Amino acid sequence: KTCAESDFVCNNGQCVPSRWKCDGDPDCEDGSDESPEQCHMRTCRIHEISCGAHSTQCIPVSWRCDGENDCDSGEDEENCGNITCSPDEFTCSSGRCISRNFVCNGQDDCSDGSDELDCAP
Ligand SMILES: [Ca+2]
Ligand SMILES: [Ca+2]
Ligand SMILES: [Ca+2]
Numbered sequence: 001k002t003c004a005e006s007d008f009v010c011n012n013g014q015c016v017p018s019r020w021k022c023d024g025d026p027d028c029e030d031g032s033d034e035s036p037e038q039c040h041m042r043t044c045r046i047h048e049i050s051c052g053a054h055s056t057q058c059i060p061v062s063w064r065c066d067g068e069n070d071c072d073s074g075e076d077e078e079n080c081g082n083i084t085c086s087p088d089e090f091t092c093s094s095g096r097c098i099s100r101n102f103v104c105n106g107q108d109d110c111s112d113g114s115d116e117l118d119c120a121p
Pocket of ligand 1: 020021022023024025026027028033034
């Protein structure tokens with residue numbers, strides 16, 4: 001009662017045969033059927049724009065603070081909503097920036113703990 005062997009597994013535990021690849025199809029409740037996990041070579045489509053036709057990078061257009069997404073390497077708008085930090089800093093769940101040394105080291109630090117919100121492998 002499961003997809004065919006060559007099927008592609010989705011990140012939300014959902015199952016989608018190889019034909020629902022990054023193709024603009026919201027089939028995964030978490031929108032990540034078109035992310036680097038399944039579309040590990042291309043970017044999502046609609047509800048997420050293209051930052052690199054040469055790599056796997058799709059993000060939600062909401063970071064177009066200048067009317068464009070320029071995040072080729074997440075440099076122009078990383079955490080552009082909350083606070084604009086410098087891409088060379090550790091993006092906080094609230095947008096804040098701290099030293100990359102506080103990157104989820106299994107210990108809270110930036111605000112409360114979100115700094116490690118599901119920071120597992
Ligand atoms: Ca899809
Ligand atoms: Ca932008
Ligand atoms: Ca930490």
